[model samples]
Target chain A: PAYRILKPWWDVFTDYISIVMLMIAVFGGTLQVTQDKMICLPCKWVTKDSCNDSTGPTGIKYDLDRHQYNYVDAVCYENRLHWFAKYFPYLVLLHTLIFLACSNFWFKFPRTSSKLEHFVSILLKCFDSPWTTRALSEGVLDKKEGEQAKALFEKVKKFRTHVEEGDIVYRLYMRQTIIKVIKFALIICYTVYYVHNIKFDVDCTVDIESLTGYRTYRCAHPLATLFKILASFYISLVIFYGLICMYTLWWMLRRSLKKYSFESIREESSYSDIPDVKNDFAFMLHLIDQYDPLYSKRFAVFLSEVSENKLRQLNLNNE
Target chain B: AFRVLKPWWDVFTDYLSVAMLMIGVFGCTLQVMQDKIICLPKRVQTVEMKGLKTDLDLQQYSFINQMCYERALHWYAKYFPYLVLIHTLVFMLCSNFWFKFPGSSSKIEHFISILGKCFDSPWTTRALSEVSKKEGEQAKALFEKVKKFRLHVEEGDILYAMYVRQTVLKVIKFLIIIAYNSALVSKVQFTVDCNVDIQDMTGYKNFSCNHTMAHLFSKLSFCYLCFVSIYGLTCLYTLYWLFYRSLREYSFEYVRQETGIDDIPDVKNDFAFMLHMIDQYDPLYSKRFAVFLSEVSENKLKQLNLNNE
Candidate 1:
């Protein structure tokens, strides 16, 4: 089966949000490419009659009086539009991709993954070992399975001491989440700053004094409403990702993951031999516990040498 | 330096400060390496007015350039980089100043010495290796020495107070820099129209000018603020860390509960400060160091492993 031990619900949920975010970004990019970006018409000041309110909710509008059908379209498109609004979809796509990569980084990175893989490998074996099965099943406790469970427990202890001497997993998680939260903040800050740049009317001064001697022209960028919808939605996804990343950092550093608390298990069961394991060992168990607390309750049996010793002691007595 | 007392944010900010330094240096390069300011249609005005001198008319165009330069590009365009470099250097010293002072220096000196003895020394290897030698006697004495030293130094709040003060100072310095940057930030406009006495030279006076570097300057300013804001947040987080639970005393509530060492004594002030640093370096360091603070010794640690089996 796939490793469900380390992929916490929050992690899985964030992947969905980012994928949705990615989809939205790509959809926006397709629209940006296919549709016209803007339409322009030179404003009139004739007999107090005007082209005013021509930008009504028509989802369509008329271009008045042959406002340089060629020149104004070319000129306004050149300079009037904001940089961010012009490239909003592409930035959304780029930033969303980075967010997705960061979410999955710990799993794919070499140093951290080796540790994660080894722990999951050990965690599954400990879960499936016969001694654990015998203890968990409604059968009479039995046999020579102590050596296997005990050696596995020894591996757990050895791995803990070996890996806990340094904290690549802990440090990487901190660094990645920190990078994520700050980027989200900067994204929101800049996005809000530029939102005003996306508007219906643009009063742009075109340097066509020789071409028409016209000082300025009233211009309109298309896709304002649609672009606003996507941009606002993009910010919302960024906000959600930021909040989750904040919760993740809090879940990570708020408590010391270096030690496990099997106190409840010990009190509830005869598993008093389940000593607290910590660092990455404790970290993995805590992650699994979020999925199901019961995973580690039985998994703890193999971790406890004394519990296996108890099982072996009873095996001979029953015999 | 495997510092346990300093939180991850503190170490995190040292890197953030480096980022800010690079940004500040980049801002300086943007200011110096490129044209500081650009004016528009003065050349147009020159052509128009040359149509309308000799040396005097040329001087009038230069005069119009000077007037426009003063109105928009004032002190900010000229000296903003120097200001940024100065503030960046000021903060570099502020963050590291704790280690440089006599008050905090002694604390670190004792800490590193004790840290080396506790975890890094060859003596600890032999002390923890096995129980077969008379060296066990030295382990007992070494514990006594460590114990007495902790007791003497942990009484006052020297290290705790010093760290808090350093954090407070950083908070002030960063906030001031932020306000200073943001206030002047508004003045660096992309393009401006300057009304001056150039009507004497030109037939018409209203000339719209383009700032040579304002577009790039604004872009650089926005980018610099993004980085600096993150830096400011980290500094505030450091201050938040200081008062969150009060750093004066650190006791191993969880370690004792896990290790089954009921009498793992509490440590405070500088001793707790140093132990917190060790915890960051490796929880195992404090995990092993806990044995010294426990009711008894490593014999119990060895026997606990042995007895469980």
Candidate 2:
């Protein structure tokens, strides 16, 4: 029964988990400062003359006869609180940096530019029909090309289609999903532990002078807590990343070592168009010729002569 | 002299590569099985840490190492077996080379032909020469249009060098595997502690495992056994193919000497061209030709040359 209420929110959160986590961390770190409130120092009630003289030895702030500084704050108590407040801002900055670093590593991270671009493209596709000429223009056949080039482009369109439609893409999707869920669990557990450990206490038993004065309110170091969580998370991420890198490198090494050309080709996405013919009979020769200059020059001449002629003569009217 | 000796060096290494493949499969399996047999009694053990009076067993265990072992085993046992099973099943289902759908020869037949041709033989060598002649004409026709018809010549050399590089790497890999297994065996201590109750813990069996070496070997045997079973026929056939190449080299050298083609202009480039062209038509052509050259007599070359003329 409770799951029904929580399921919708869980789904929403999971979809934008990276962005959600980032916002929560940033807000948590800045909430105390941005709210226009400062934690007062816990100090014993001392004489005004005594407090003025005590500035040199204990780094005391000036006390007024009628102000809260006279009763609410003390030099000795503020010194202890100074450590927490002084380091909190640096922790906030560190948290932001770590969040960015992790997002940079993960492709499906909600706030990543790639993820945003994917969303925007999907949005545009919904509004725009197939008749809308929204084809990729980069390194493709542009308006500047001659009639022959346009003809060639149509002939080789299937060859240049870059849809990642294969078992490899499926495998990649599954791997990313597994890693994201595991990492999400780790982050949640760490966050909960950090928040739970945060303690506040009002005690007057520590010092002898606090017998009749106001009690001291002490809290755990938020900076240290944030640092400990981020540090542990970073270490886990590094180990996970290392293992993935090693496995990928091992597979690549095996392929190169064996030179099992057929197996490699099988692993590659299947082509609808006649393979290598696109390169051999068109201006697409540079795809393979990038390795050597001599071949590249030869391919250039072929493109200008035979390739262009062959492309111009190609007939697609029947099809 | 180094150039002359280089061909022989290639021949030696090619055979050695075949030997290494066979040895790697057999050696890894045997070592693993032998280790399992010797360490059967010590499969479980309970040893207290040094200078500690506590009831805990430390015999030096770490989380990282335990995780590595468990994961490796899981990968071998769970993931790899399925891939091997599917591959084996596919081969079993399509065992007959002549099992055709609508073609003169089946898919398996075509594959087998390619495999057979790659080995050194008289027929393969003769076919290699024929393909070279045809490709030369094709190159000439392509030259007027592309000006790079002979690019295959360069590619042939690249493939040969790539093959050589692969063989050298295999040698290094063979050495590393041996060294690694030896180290793993030496460090691993097996335990057979019957005293400890399995019901005491449910999931920590993998973590509390002290016999990492034995576990690793058991996992390796699974890995190698699957690979060997799947590729056994292909691998043995390849070994025989290597021997045929060795036999054919004598005929190949004689033809080269008689035709005075032993010294060609841009030897590497010309060979590369011929090999690359053959490869486009048939991948096995070059390897077979390399070995087949040894058995070609002057009389045979004359007939071949006369036929071409």
Candidate 3:
């Protein structure tokens, strides 16, 4: 019943959100180049013979500050905007690196054997049910785990439904909804900010001797404005997705840390007295063992093997 | 009398872990070679400087093969970020055995699990002791022995030991990265001899192999350190979990009680308590556990609904 009520939207989205984010990043980078010119000043038309010639090109008035013809390369180097534009590719590349790291795409690509792939695979397991948006997106798991994992998902679907009925699912769902809502708001705000901040008329100079005078480039930022609007959505996606990912990571870590706690035996022993709880817990353990035999083995080892010597020593007199 | 010493390793399942290690080795080798003096180009030539020449010659000159240096810079810049990402992935793969629940079917998990077996030696040995159902009494005895062994492993001291090991490893990694980067930063030079005759260029020029090598190494080290810092933060997160888990008094009654009230409850607190119950038994003990318990409850609830029906 709980499974029927709970939606698997977040589980479905996790599969491809990074690829979308990466596309946005690439678009932002392109806008950085086309929206602004790398060099704004006119390049001095000088031949090898006229390398030292200071004669201004016809119809081009010299600026009072230099009284010399402005050159393309010099203007690009001297101006701060041009410098950023010149190194814009590097900036874009670095931005891509940062994006990959933040969005978890860095771990996904090159198909490395990383823990991130494991993390993704495990999360993708939640989407195996038809209730989720779609089947697991391509390349989420290794070929070996692929079909085998689907079987486990089918077996465990009811269990997932039960867990979703609990507070953890409700909270996770609530947070997911809140994040999406906030992201939508932020996207709107970022678009509005871009519209307000972008300049329509940018100054430029012509290379040709006849049209050498400074001219206003109209609506230079219109395309950049649209690009930034898309960028806003990408930024929002990253912000919210990062938050959700961190939260999930924390839960996963906390679950892992629970192994080191000493009170498990005491708790399990008390629950062992209750037939319902005992049967439930044992059944759960058995089901898990069926799902992943290796995990069961590992759990048995961590549980009983790690502390065996001490147990033998303590119970030596009883034997 | 039965013994199974290597319970952790299985060839078919663990190949990817080995492959990852090899890839990590390759990445490290690239980093080393990229950093070393041997990788630099040997030749030099003259080139016209495009920017404003601050020097007196008005023509900025450096190592020759300007195209080569530019290409090298471009290549290194593109690949180095990827390399750092790979290294971080490797570090995580090597260390993150405990975090995987529902069992990681990946070779990375298997490899790290094996490494974890070494670190948790006492546990592995106990796990290796075969428990045969045919020998009922002996099997029971062995099972009890294992439970007690786990108790010992769960002791605060072992957790602290693990925490210390993790911290120490991270610190050493940080120091090595710092030392490496600092060596590159302080000792190596980037610019080549600006004024040199085309024929007289002997040792160094703009975009010379040495310059490219030094620059590449420096970039690699920087990338290495950046990734290490990111990995270090995650390492610290695990430590936080270790410390906090060690402090809690886990109980099933609490789990049942928490589970009872949580159709919609204080998520963080209740979920954490529930997770401890799952973790105490097995980290992968989630859906399976919930499913079984739900099946029982559903049976009873179903029966009640049938009577009402």
Best model number under DockQ: 3
In CAPRI terms, model 1 is classed as incorrect
* lDDT, candidate 1, A188-239, per-residue tens: 9999889778787776666543333333556777777778888888888888
Query: Residue A199: error of model 2 in Å?
Result: 24
Lowest summed lDDT window (length 10), candidate 1 chain B? B45-54
lDDT of 2 by residue, A19-125 (tens): 43444345345544432122233333334312211111111221222234223334323444434333433443454455444433434453333432432233233
Clashes of each: 7, 24, 14
In candidate 1, which residue pairs clash?
A258-A278, A258-A279, B4-B276, B4-B277, B4-B278, B5-B277, B38-B212
Q: Residues B16-49, candidate 2, lDDT per residue (tens digit)? A: 4344345444433343221121111111229877
Order the numbered candidates by lDDT, best leading.
1, 3, 2
Name model 1 segments beyond 4 Å from true: A1-319, B2-6, B40-63, B116-138, B196-207, B252-263, B279-284, B294-309
Per-residue lDDT of model 1, residues B210-230, tens digit only: 454454456556666776788
Model 2 stretches with alpha carbons more than 4 Å out:
A1-319, B1-152, B155-161, B186-189, B192-253, B256-266, B269-309
Tens-place lDDT per residue, model 3, B173-270, is 54564465455444334433232234344343332323423433454455555545554554555446546664234433443453442222221222
